[PDB]
Amino acid sequence: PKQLRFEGERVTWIQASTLKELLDLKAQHPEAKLVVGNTEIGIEMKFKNQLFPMIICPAWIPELNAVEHGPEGISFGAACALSSVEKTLLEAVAKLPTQKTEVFRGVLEQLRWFAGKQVKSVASLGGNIITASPISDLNPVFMASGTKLTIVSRGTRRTVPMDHTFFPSYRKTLLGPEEILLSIEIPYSREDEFFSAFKQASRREDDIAKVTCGMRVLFQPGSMQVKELALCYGGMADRTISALKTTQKQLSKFWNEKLLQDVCAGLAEELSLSPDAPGGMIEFRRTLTLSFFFKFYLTVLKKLG
Amino acid sequence: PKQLRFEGERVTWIQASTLKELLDLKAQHPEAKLVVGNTEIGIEMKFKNQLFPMIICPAWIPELNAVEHGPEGISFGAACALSSVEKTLLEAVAKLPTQKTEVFRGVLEQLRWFAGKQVKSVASLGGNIITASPISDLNPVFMASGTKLTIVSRGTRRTVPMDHTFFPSYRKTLLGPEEILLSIEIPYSREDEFFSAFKQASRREDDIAKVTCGMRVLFQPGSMQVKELALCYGGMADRTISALKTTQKQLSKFWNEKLLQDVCAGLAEELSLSPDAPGGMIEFRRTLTLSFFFKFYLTVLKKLG
Amino acid sequence: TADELVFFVNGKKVVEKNADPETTLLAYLRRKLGLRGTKLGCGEGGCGACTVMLSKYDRLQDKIIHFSANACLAPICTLHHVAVTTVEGIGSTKTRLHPVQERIAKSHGSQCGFCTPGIVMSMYTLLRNQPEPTVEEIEDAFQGNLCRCTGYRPILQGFRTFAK
Amino acid sequence: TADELVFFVNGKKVVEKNADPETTLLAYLRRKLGLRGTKLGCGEGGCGACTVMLSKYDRLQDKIIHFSANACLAPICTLHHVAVTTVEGIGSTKTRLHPVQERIAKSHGSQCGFCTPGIVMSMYTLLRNQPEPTVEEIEDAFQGNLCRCTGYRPILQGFRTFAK
Amino acid sequence: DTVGRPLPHLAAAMQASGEAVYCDDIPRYENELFLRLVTSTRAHAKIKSIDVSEAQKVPGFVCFLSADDIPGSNETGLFNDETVFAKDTVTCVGHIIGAVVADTPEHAERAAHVVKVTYEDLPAIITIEDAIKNNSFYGSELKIEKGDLKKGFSEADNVVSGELYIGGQDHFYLETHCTIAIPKGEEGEMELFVSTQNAMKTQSFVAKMLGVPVNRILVRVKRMGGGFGGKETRSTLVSVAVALAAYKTGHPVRCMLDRNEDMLITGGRHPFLARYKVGFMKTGTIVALEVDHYSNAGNSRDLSHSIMERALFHMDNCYKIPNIRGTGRLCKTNLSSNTAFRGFGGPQALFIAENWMSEVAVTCGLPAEEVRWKNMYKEGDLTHFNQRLEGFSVPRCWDECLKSSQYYARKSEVDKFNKENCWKKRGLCIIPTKFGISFTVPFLNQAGALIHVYTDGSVLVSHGGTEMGQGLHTKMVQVASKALKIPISKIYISETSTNTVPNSSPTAASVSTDIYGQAVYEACQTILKRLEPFKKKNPDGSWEDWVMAAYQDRVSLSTTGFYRTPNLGYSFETNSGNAFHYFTYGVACSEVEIDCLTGDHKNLRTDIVMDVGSSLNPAIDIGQVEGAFVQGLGLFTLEELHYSPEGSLHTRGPSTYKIPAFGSIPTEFRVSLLRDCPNKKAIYASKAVGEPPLFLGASVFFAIKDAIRAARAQHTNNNTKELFRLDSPATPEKIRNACVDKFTT
Amino acid sequence: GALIHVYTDGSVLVSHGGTEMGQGLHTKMVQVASKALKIPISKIYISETSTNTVPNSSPTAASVSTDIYGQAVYEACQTILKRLEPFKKKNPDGSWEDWVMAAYQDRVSLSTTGFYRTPNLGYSFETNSGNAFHYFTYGVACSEVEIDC
Amino acid sequence: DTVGRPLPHLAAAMQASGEAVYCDDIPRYENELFLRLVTSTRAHAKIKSI
Ligand SMILES: Cc1cc2nc3c(=O)[nH]c(=O)nc-3n(C[C@H](O)[C@H](O)[C@H](O)COP(=O)(O)OP(=O)(O)OC[C@H]3O[C@@H](n4cnc5c(N)ncnc54)[C@H](O)[C@@H]3O)c2cc1C
Ligand SMILES: Cc1cc2nc3c(=O)[nH]c(=O)nc-3n(C[C@H](O)[C@H](O)[C@H](O)COP(=O)(O)OP(=O)(O)OC[C@H]3O[C@@H](n4cnc5c(N)ncnc54)[C@H](O)[C@@H]3O)c2cc1C
Ligand SMILES: Nc1nc2c(c(=O)[nH]1)N[C@H]1C(S)=C(S)[C@@H](COP(=O)(O)O)O[C@H]1N2
Ligand code: FES
Ligand code: FES
Ligand code: FES
Ligand code: FES
């Protein structure tokens, strides 16, 4: 395979055959748009009337399609189709002990009533992440689990866990102008670690006001005493957000009725929407942030007591 | 104006701006086809399935369009439209003494129920001559009058009166591979010089068996004693022919009933057709060679007695 | 590495960048320019259905010259810097008919109509050269145009009105 | 100085020498290749009317892989060395209908018929991957296809006959 | 003879192979151009300027079209209150200002986006509540009133009042609006290929815009990829635009709307606001009813008045109410003009009836089935509009549905589930429908046909009806085959066209099978009479031979057929005369399961029993019942249109507007056609089936409402006889909010 | 055969089996329908000949087209006139347009076939009897020529 | 009433302007192809090969 060049009335397309080409091209043209499945770029160009005079397609590059099993979890090249991620995670879930697949099963739950086969067969993992939609069903799960992102440019390579700081403002991520997301490692579940993922079954605006979440609790060995707690939400702001103020207060508390009530009060306050917040459904959305946590609360108890 | 070059699937066309270009091109590519009006070539290419991979169009060249009045007659560039030839000759005829326009009026007679204005506006003079159709209405008149032809290639220039030798075989003329017809001088009529032109009002085959003629007599000063006699016929052979054997016998004879009979007998014999000559109409064509001469014979008497 | 052919059709510039020497003006008008008023009747110069007017500045004569031609036989490659006028170039029922078009129509000079543009263009050409023709000029203008429907009488009767 | 795009549609080679990056596969099928079985329903990946199958040799996996895609969102410039199969690729009333096409037709799974090629292509793709699917695989194959006429029951009853 | 047989849609095999041609599948002419509409982005504003400089720079740009290029008339619409192109002011977000013409659809799209318009905003009215407050209505109040309302209310034990809202609906035909216009270049002649249910009005509106007689315009319709009412009048928005570009350029022009344009521009189902008051007895028996309806009509009249008439005709549903007053107003608003949608105001008014009927039963502490059955009309009863109900078959459908659904046994198991579950509840509801059959404007109830027999014995049928998936042409071929007594393989329907059948009513009102059936039947009787002499001369010969003998004896093998629906003419003064030729009846039972923590729900089971007379085609009719019902479940539970406070639609594609999916339908889904109930009033004893079953999708709404009731008993109140307001669509937002608990508080 | 439609604007569309080849059949048919209907020729149009409007037509031939299609068109016009008569009586001083619209609104069909069959034809080559033609057209010409012998 | 009157052919004005459409004047579809007959050059003969 060799690099291909296509030229239109308005757009120049380069099909990169190799990671090195991709990173060289990206450093020569930092404003160039990566396109993989085009399930978002195609919408942006058609409906939001964006024009990207220069596009690079990295879909051929072997590194961006690699599926790897490591000690920490399963890594997926950023160009892996959602169907491939789903197939891999289904196979992992069937093979591994339940205790190690809490996050995998959370990923799969968000993928359940996602798009049809036609979209999942071409929509990429990295594309969903870097799209950075406020209502992405995947970024809450990745944020809650601390999914590790490998991010590369010419010279530079760095791995970071996904956290609140990765999505600084609307539709924006923590990548430089010349950077591309290489791979994503979805972690194994530890002992005393539990996870859930929930979603509003219906959006009403294109990219706001659909509640979706990823929830993780890690307990002290053999106990019900909180060691770590992460509650991450889409649909509640112009970005994926973490309820950090609420969960920080629950560190070294016990999983009881008192925790339930303290989290709900923290959530109701930390994630409160103004009456004219974009997207409306103000009461419903509030109720969902609390009801979803209740769902997580009861599921965790069943996984314990 | 500059030379233009057009390239198609099968044909390369060169529009020459200049005599020099024409002659250089013609020497470099002796097989190249000159096209002016295309009223013959277009028929040849469409209906007789000729292909000429290389065409030169000399219509722009000023020499090939030049109308000149000399002491001997009126010269026309080979590219002059028949309509221009006709307009010039009508103007000459209205202005000059009848005695000087016997040939001009014979040219005009052949042009009378020729094609329509659309054809005469683009069909060239040199084109009709070099076509060399056995039934050309013009070549008999030119042959009978001894119309002078200027013929040029690179280096070479030569003027010849048109005679029997100019059309050696079917569709062929006495030009070299590299030669073009430059101009044509239609002569003034002399004292004691008389001319007629006649034609069959109807062809039945595309290029044979339509009788057409040009007839010239030159008498000794003030007499009825034949000095020169030229009887030229189309439609009687695969080429324009002259009844030389018949007319040579009449030299220094008198324009009487005895000459009438002698010429008719010469004609009937010299121009005899075999029963299955191409184009048929054997009796009719015979009858017309004689009836046309009779018409000339009587008209000459009226111009005299 | 080929030259551009530039001509005009009905007052409008045609730049052809890949002219084929074998392309007749008829083919070009109908099938390139989509001007279907000019008709194929024989393709051999005898019927005149394809008659159009041509116009050029004559580098010899001075003058702009106007003359009729058979589009079926005119190679486009002869027309560089030539102005073409077809039947749609002179008038229409959408806008206004030329007097020639109106008079052939009202005089019953058109039956099937297929010869009409050709005959219209021959008459038009005559008028553009000679605005006040004789009756004799008028009948001799059409030796190139055939009509199978009318028997010709109405057409000359109608155009006769342009004379004297 | 542009590269040629080479792909296949219904077993037939397409060489595009001037590919425009903005050209969707839908536009290409319909308006370039004249294959109008594949339909526009939304142009945003929601309805599946434009579903086609795609096939490639996977340079990682080994294998030829088959998968459905939305033609409305697939840039042609992603399809270099990819084989496209549309509804006309699998069967016709002129030749022979594929069992998928026959069964949706006879089971009353087609009313206006506008969604039918897309639904046919989703089922087809499922069967090309799994010749003996479960009933569960069959209902879940269509999350990407919308039908406004049928209320879906007849389609699933028809295709249910492929299971077990 | 295939009448009563489950014969598949004639085109179904070709639709499955992608060989069936829809408007945009027709091949382009070499010189064919593409049009894109330029549309308002303000709800109410003055147009201050239109700038096309940047559009003129798009490659392939041909021209921009506006009100000033129109040769005839800019005045359009059903009541002449629309423009083809807005000139001074725009009056909704979808409002058509102009159109770009280009050489490809991609260039037309690029050029249209870059057309810049300048506005000065004006006071806008968007909601029904805005329109009531501003007295912004078309026309005056419509009203049907029977009995004595003071007095009925005096006699009543209990009186419940309330307000109810039902949102609109996007048609979501898979094939969007599409027109090809071919100008001939002679005498203003134009030929149009259109995805429309109304070839006649297309023809008229195009002729009107062009200032040209109707005889110059030929409109042709082969098939639509769905219509559902959406193409009955609104198609002309595209058609006239495209006729204009054709006239102006002299080239063929086409346009097919992208989903997002179609949704914004072409209008949908009328949102209804109802204020109601019912008087009843402790037993459940209704004694008085008062309903004021308000429809959100949008920015023109269109079919809004007729829709409101059909709503007043259906405010009874299947219940005898001795004292009744129904009124309706049409709200003039700065939204895209709303139009026909399967049901034509019926579902709205039937939803309002079943709502107060649900509240009657909760107030009386009675079982819902009991209260409905006891209030039900009997055979021979008059309606509030004084039309006798002959062959009222709801009781048969009811008892048959109870039996087949095993209602009473599943009522127990629903209560068992609810006793045993805390955060999930089940609901169960049985619901009747009746739907009146005819256009309510009597003059639309006319139908023509044209039949030709060719000398090979093959038959070509043409009628005024259009195919949009409902299998009209299939049913017409079945009718002609039975009438002519020849195999269906001898008869062909090609297309609908204004040069074969003139002046045709829109394909609408569920009456097409009825009226064109009859017109075709009549044409076939004419043929049969003409062929009868030859049939006698040669009694053992073939159809082919009789036809050839008829040709050779110079007997015409071509005839028109015409039908006019008898005995129709209702008067809103007098309250008398028949509004409908007959009623189609049905009953559905549905069970759902709600997730009280999410508002999410499962459709567990639905049983339908429909009275469709003697079905001409069981397979087609069952498919209409199922398709309609699923469109109703969409209406009542899933589909929600959403606007900005400035009146701009947000929901403009399948990602933001959810029509029912494969996985939306009831897990167990049973439809039965009622046996031995022939209809005297229609062709071969059949009944209209297109629109009547859609409202039966409300059984899902009221099953959901029952489940919410159980969640409310679990976590909110101890008051059984509690009423709470649940608007349509009952989406997860509305369901969840109604399940008041420790979380909602 | 013939088929005529009156649209609701009062505009008329005529279709018959005859084809136009320059002889002015459509012109003559429009003249006949204008006369029979009693409306100006500007209200009537003939578009084309087509097998889906008029089936089984004989070739446009034998000089009989004006004769036979003239009759069929005439007959279709009589049917339109009968159907419009009640509305003409209800509004004797109204216009064609109003009578047509009133007809449409009362659900009267404004579409009809027309058919004509030449009577009394059937010649036998055995018996040498029965009419071969409906009638004969007659004429006389005098010509003078000059020949060139 | 024009019967008996010298009314010009209805299409005569459009024939004179070249606006009247004859068969080859109809526009070509983008995918429209062209046919040419292959014809005998012999009056009576057996076809031996094409
Ligand atoms: C019908 C439909 C339904 C959908 N439903 C859901 C849903 O329910 N929940 C949900 O969360 N999402 C949903 N999506 C969104 C979808 O999953 C994403 O659009 C998709 O994964 C993006 O991937 P892509 O390969 O098509 O990216 P593209 O459109 O090609 O690109 C997306 C963005 O990512 C950038 N990009 C891609 N790869 C890299 C790289 N590795 N490094 C840096 N930048 C990169 C591109 O520049 C671009 O800005 C839906 C989409 C469709 C069409
Ligand atoms: C329908 C119609 C009617 C006609 N009727 C008659 C008629 O009644 N009587 C009659 O005699 N003819 C008649 N002709 C023939 C007509 O006169 C010739 O076709 C015309 O004169 C040829 O000129 P052209 O410019 O069109 O030649 P082209 O077609 O351009 O060329 C003619 C031939 O001459 C050659 N040629 C042209 N110029 C030169 C040159 N300067 N030097 C060397 N070779 C040259 C070309 O190479 C070609 O071989 C008729 C033609 C048509 C179309
Ligand atoms: N497939 C299909 N079924 C359909 C529709 C449609 O567009 N497609 N429209 C419905 C509506 S709105 C009506 S009024 C009826 C009308 O056609 P009919 O009179 O032949 O039932 O079809 C109904 N069923
Ligand atoms: S077509 Fe007959 S002269 Fe050109
Ligand atoms: S009118 Fe018919 S050929 Fe002239
Ligand atoms: S057109 Fe609807 S998904 Fe492609
Ligand atoms: S059959 Fe009409 S959309 Fe499915």
Side-chain angles (χ1 to χ4, degrees), chain B residues 283-299:
Chain B
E283 293 185 20
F284 179 55
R285 285 203 272 157
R286 284 170 172 279
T287 296
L288 284 182
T289 60
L290 309 199
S291 307
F292 281 169
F293 177 76
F294 184 51
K295 266 187 190 210
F296 182 48
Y297 170 82
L298 294 182
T299 307

Side-chain angles (χ1 to χ4, degrees), chain A residues 9-10 46-47 49 113 201-206 264 281 283-284 287-288 290-292 294-295 298, chain E residues 59 107 109-110 113 258 260 423 595 597-598 600 640 642 650-651 655-656 732-733 736-737 743-744:
Chain A
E9 306 183 62
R10 305 196 296 168
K46 182 167 180 66
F47 298 99
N49 305 288
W113 289 101
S202 57
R203 85 228 226 181
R204 177 221 254 184
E205 328 267 301
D206 345 287
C264 282
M281 285 173 130
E283 292 182 29
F284 177 56
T287 293
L288 282 185
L290 310 199
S291 298
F292 285 161
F294 182 52
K295 269 188 192 214
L298 298 180
Chain E
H107 294 334
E109 173 177 51
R110 289 193 216 160
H113 175 53
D258 252 322
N260 76 301
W423 303 108
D595 187 325
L597 284 160
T598 62
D600 193 303
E640 190 201 7
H642 181 80
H650 282 326
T651 61
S655 54
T656 53
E733 175 194 12
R736 183 68 187 89
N737 282 351
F743 306 100
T744 77

Side-chain angles (χ1 to χ4, degrees), chain A residues 148-176:
Chain A
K148 287 200 192 146
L149 307 177
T150 305
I151 300 152
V152 183
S153 59
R154 183 170 54 192
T156 78
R157 185 185 186 101
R158 73 194 173 94
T159 311
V160 299
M162 197 183 299
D163 61 346
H164 65 274
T165 74
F166 195 67
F167 303 113
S169 57
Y170 176 68
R171 288 301 187 95
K172 235 164 131 293
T173 51
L174 220 70
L175 309 198

Side-chain angles (χ1 to χ4, degrees), chain C residues 2-36:
Chain C
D3 281 279
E4 284 165 35
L5 180 64
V6 180
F7 60 106
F8 278 68
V9 180
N10 292 332
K12 188 162 187 68
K13 193 170 138 179
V14 177
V15 185
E16 172 63 52
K17 296 166 197 301
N18 299 290
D20 195 311
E22 285 187 73
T23 304
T24 69
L25 168 59
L26 188 63
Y28 201 91
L29 298 167
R30 296 183 59 83
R31 285 177 254 127
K32 227 282 172 196
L33 301 178
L35 293 178
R36 290 138 200 141

Side-chain angles (χ1 to χ4, degrees), chain C residues 1 17-18 37 72 82 96 116 139 160:
Chain C
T1 169
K17 296 166 197 301
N18 299 290
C72 72
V82 174
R96 272 159 181 287
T116 316
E139 212 234 50
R160 206 201 158 176

